[PDB]
Design an enzyme around this catalytic site. Structure first.
Site, PDB file in Angstrom:
ATOM      1  CG  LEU A  14       2.512   4.990  -1.133  1.00  0.00           C
ATOM      2  CD1 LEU A  14       3.268   3.858  -0.485  1.00  0.00           C
ATOM      3  CD2 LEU A  14       1.060   5.140  -0.846  1.00  0.00           C
ATOM      4  N   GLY A  15       1.454  18.208  -2.110  1.00  0.00           N
ATOM      5  CA  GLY A  15       2.143  17.610  -0.857  1.00  0.00           C
ATOM      6  C   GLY A  15       2.851  16.125  -0.855  1.00  0.00           C
ATOM      7  CB  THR A  16       4.289  14.158   1.580  1.00  0.00           C
ATOM      8  OG1 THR A  16       3.871  14.038   2.764  1.00  0.00           O
ATOM      9  CG2 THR A  16       5.401  15.480   1.496  1.00  0.00           C
ATOM     10  CE  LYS A  34      -4.857  12.812  -2.430  1.00  0.00           C
ATOM     11  NZ  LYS A  34      -5.902  13.381  -3.327  1.00  0.00           N
ATOM     12  CG  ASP A 119      -9.300  14.762 -12.173  1.00  0.00           C
ATOM     13  OD1 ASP A 119      -8.797  14.723 -13.250  1.00  0.00           O
ATOM     14  OD2 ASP A 119      -8.278  15.193 -11.123  1.00  0.00           O
TER      15      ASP A 119
END
Ligand SMILES: O=S1(=O)NCc2ccc(Nc3nccc(N(CCCO)c4cccc5[nH]ncc45)n3)cc21
Length: 257
Positions: A14, A15-16, A34, A119
């Site tokens: 959809l 690191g990874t 995550k 952020d």
């Protein structure tokens, strides 16, 4: 901590990041995960989001320690707001106002909880539906101390300057008022259908532009009241910049008018 047994992941990425499913008491919940330094940042985010509870902030389900290290959130199915608007320029102004008002209700709660996001950008607003936004990505967020109004940035890490208020750039001071500045940039992004702010400009060029009193223009088709609100959020002197209660009210009044 979560039970690996109760978590199922898609293969598709959809690191990874992966989409998955977690068996709650009887219902199965769609989650986004995550999957792992980069770990202390994910631990800081878990620590913050475990203290948060608001319809307009992404909910943490928990942490799963298995073959890999995993941070499991409830799934906001439509994904980042910047990307969604880029691919859907039909979205009406009133719908954008609705989504940005929801973000401000979420930030009002954070402010009241005395947390700074640090952020706040369109990429960190995820859509549950076309009419339901949640604030995400609390990696840089900080719980303010009981005796302070601001967080003093020390270590040099990610620095999204185009969303940063002058006192952040000049004095390394992050407060809820700095998050207001960023919210203003987020509005601009949303009314520009997910275009990047200050395009073609270096961070030091953006800073020089702001110090001259220059601001980004009104996006095409942005109602003037909403542009006036962006400029208010971009009030240079943090002392005179509004907080999220004043910002949220003005979006509420307009939207319902
Ligand atoms: O990864 S994507 O940007 N690629 C397309 C897409 C579609 C839906 C979601 N929705 C979603 N909904 C909730 C949480 C979450 N993520 C992945 C965000 C990528 O950074 C998260 C997982 C764990 C902690 C998180 N904090 N904030 C988001 C988030 N993502 C995320 C994405």
């Amino acid at each position: 901590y979560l039970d690996r047994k109760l978590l199922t992941l898609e293969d598709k990425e959809l690191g990874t990041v992966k989409k998955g499913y977690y068996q709650m008491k009887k219902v199965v919940k769609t989650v986004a995960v995550k999957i792992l330094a980069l770990k202390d940042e994910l631990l800081a985010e878990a620590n913050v989001m475990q203290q948060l509870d608001n319809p307009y902030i992404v909910r943490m389900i928990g942490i799963c320690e298995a073959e890999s290290w995993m941070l499991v959130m409830e799934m906001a199915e439509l994904g980042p707001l910047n990307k969604y608007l880029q691919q859907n320029r039909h979205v009406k102004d009133k719908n954008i106002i609705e989504l940005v008002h929801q973000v401000s209700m979420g930030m009002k709660y954070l402010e009241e909880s005395n947390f700074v996001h640090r952020d706040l950008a369109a990429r960190n607003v995820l859509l549950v539906t076309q009419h339901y936004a949640k604030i995400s990505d609390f990696g840089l967020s900080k719980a303010l101390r009981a005796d302070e109004n601001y967080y003093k940035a020390q270590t040099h890490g990610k620095w999204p300057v185009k969303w940063y208020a002058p006192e952040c750039i000049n004095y390394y001071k992050f407060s809820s008022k700095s998050d207001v500045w960023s919210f203003g940039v987020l509005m601009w992004e949303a009314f520009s259908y997910g275009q990047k702010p200050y395009r073609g400009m270096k961070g030091s060029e953006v800073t020089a532009m702001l110090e001259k009193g220059e601001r980004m223009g009104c996006p095409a088709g942005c109602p003037r009241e909403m542009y006036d609100l962006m400029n208010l959020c971009w009030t240079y002197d943090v002392e005179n910049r509004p907080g999220f209660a004043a910002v949220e009210l003005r979006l509420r009044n307009y939207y319902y008018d």
